[PDB]
Every structure is written in structure tokens, then in C-alpha cells.
Design an enzyme around this catalytic site. Sequence first.
Site, PDB file in Angstrom:
ATOM      1  N   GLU A   1      36.802  -2.011  -8.137  1.00 55.94           N
ATOM      2  CA  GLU A   1      37.657  -1.171  -7.202  1.00 55.94           C
ATOM      3  C   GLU A   1      37.809  -0.326  -8.716  1.00 55.94           C
ATOM      4  O   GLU A   1      37.638   0.990  -9.477  1.00 55.94           O
ATOM      5  CB  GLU A   1      38.736  -0.954  -6.471  1.00 55.94           C
ATOM      6  CG  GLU A   1      37.448  -1.460  -5.523  1.00 55.94           C
ATOM      7  CD  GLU A   1      36.764  -0.592  -5.255  1.00 55.94           C
ATOM      8  OE1 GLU A   1      36.562   0.551  -5.020  1.00 55.94           O
ATOM      9  OE2 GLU A   1      35.777  -1.340  -3.881  1.00 55.94           O
TER      10      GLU A   1
ATOM     11  N   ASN B   1      35.331  11.911  -5.525  1.00 52.83           N
ATOM     12  CA  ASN B   1      33.946  11.875  -4.464  1.00 52.83           C
ATOM     13  C   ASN B   1      33.539  12.955  -4.306  1.00 52.83           C
ATOM     14  O   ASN B   1      33.684  14.086  -4.468  1.00 52.83           O
ATOM     15  CB  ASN B   1      34.389  10.921  -2.978  1.00 52.83           C
ATOM     16  CG  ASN B   1      34.472   9.673  -3.340  1.00 52.83           C
ATOM     17  OD1 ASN B   1      33.776   9.138  -3.998  1.00 52.83           O
ATOM     18  ND2 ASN B   1      35.749   9.105  -2.671  1.00 52.83           N
TER      19      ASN B   1
ATOM     20  N   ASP C   1      32.803  14.612  -0.847  1.00 53.54           N
ATOM     21  CA  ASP C   1      32.403  15.003   0.254  1.00 53.54           C
ATOM     22  C   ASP C   1      34.156  15.473  -0.016  1.00 53.54           C
ATOM     23  O   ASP C   1      35.219  16.135   1.290  1.00 53.54           O
ATOM     24  CB  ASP C   1      32.733  13.449   1.007  1.00 53.54           C
ATOM     25  CG  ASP C   1      33.221  12.388   1.164  1.00 53.54           C
ATOM     26  OD1 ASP C   1      34.337  12.549   0.286  1.00 53.54           O
ATOM     27  OD2 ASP C   1      33.422  11.848   2.019  1.00 53.54           O
TER      28      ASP C   1
ATOM     29  N   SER D   1      37.106  14.628  -1.183  1.00 58.11           N
ATOM     30  CA  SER D   1      38.087  12.913  -1.037  1.00 58.11           C
ATOM     31  C   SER D   1      38.211  12.181  -1.953  1.00 58.11           C
ATOM     32  O   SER D   1      37.528  13.207  -2.890  1.00 58.11           O
ATOM     33  CB  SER D   1      38.011  12.274   0.107  1.00 58.11           C
ATOM     34  OG  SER D   1      36.526  11.683  -0.508  1.00 58.11           O
TER      35      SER D   1
ATOM     36  N   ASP E   1      39.691   9.017  -4.439  1.00 55.14           N
ATOM     37  CA  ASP E   1      40.123   7.198  -4.452  1.00 55.14           C
ATOM     38  C   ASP E   1      40.853   7.446  -5.296  1.00 55.14           C
ATOM     39  O   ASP E   1      40.604   7.259  -6.090  1.00 55.14           O
ATOM     40  CB  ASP E   1      38.537   7.114  -4.483  1.00 55.14           C
ATOM     41  CG  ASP E   1      38.033   6.745  -3.832  1.00 55.14           C
ATOM     42  OD1 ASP E   1      38.256   6.729  -2.540  1.00 55.14           O
ATOM     43  OD2 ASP E   1      36.686   5.789  -3.983  1.00 55.14           O
TER      44      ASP E   1
ATOM     45  N   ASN F   1      41.590   5.901   0.060  1.00 58.31           N
ATOM     46  CA  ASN F   1      40.690   6.790  -0.303  1.00 58.31           C
ATOM     47  C   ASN F   1      41.681   8.125   0.624  1.00 58.31           C
ATOM     48  O   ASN F   1      42.414   7.811   1.658  1.00 58.31           O
ATOM     49  CB  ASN F   1      39.149   7.198   0.777  1.00 58.31           C
ATOM     50  CG  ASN F   1      37.835   7.841   0.827  1.00 58.31           C
ATOM     51  OD1 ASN F   1      38.768   9.054   1.786  1.00 58.31           O
ATOM     52  ND2 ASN F   1      37.568   8.729  -0.377  1.00 58.31           N
TER      53      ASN F   1
END
Length: 129
Positions: free
Chosen positions: A35, A46, A48, A50, A52, A59
Site C-alpha cells: 500500500e 484518487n 473521485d 478522495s 489515500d 481513504n
Amino acid sequence: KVFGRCELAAAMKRHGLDNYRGYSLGNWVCAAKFESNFNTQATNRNTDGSTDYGILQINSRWWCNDGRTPGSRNLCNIPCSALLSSDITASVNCAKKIVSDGNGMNAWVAWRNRCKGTDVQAWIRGCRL
Ligand code: NA
């Protein structure tokens, strides 16, 4: 901060992740490896809106507030910046809520793609835990 494989394993063990929800420590170290590559300052934006954050790439749409994610919940009740600290406490505590959210470790795509079903014990080799 960039954690050392066993250094992280030890830290996660201290924070109760070993066998948490039936998930061995190796699963957690493997998830962190794929990750964020053990980098506490890892961030991934991301498409959309958002982002991480941190060592477990939590998120911003539902778990932490970064003040820039539309229709975002702050389920862990912490600013996403807190998930970027060298201290993993915040990330671990929030991850404990995420893994209990009905999908187990499947919540982490890198875990599902590179750790799920593999010999995760290898991630703890050479470690003095
Ligand atoms: Na949020």
C-alpha cells in the site's frame, strides 16, 4: 518516515494487530508493504476527489477529514494529516475499524491483489518479535 520491515512488524505487534480479527501479523506487514512501501508519508490522490493517506493508505471519503473530499465522512474522527505521522498509532486504530467494517482485509486493494492467499508468514521472517 520509512519503516524497516521488522521494525514495522514490531510496532504493529505492539498495537495489537497480530491475529486481530483473525489476520496474522504477516498480513498487516504485507498490506503496508504494497500500500505504501512502509512510507508513513505516502499519499495517493484518487480520481473521485478522495485521497489515500499514510502507511495503510486510508481513504478520505469515509475515514478521515482532509477538508477537500466531497460528501466525506470522518468515521475515525481524525484529520487525514494525522495518518501521515511517523507514529503509526492513528493509522492502526483507524485500520482496526476498517477491517471490522464488513469486508475484512479486502478493504485494502493492494492486500487483496498481492497478499491474499499467499504465504504471508514470509513478511515476518528474521524478525525478533
Ligand atoms: Na472524510
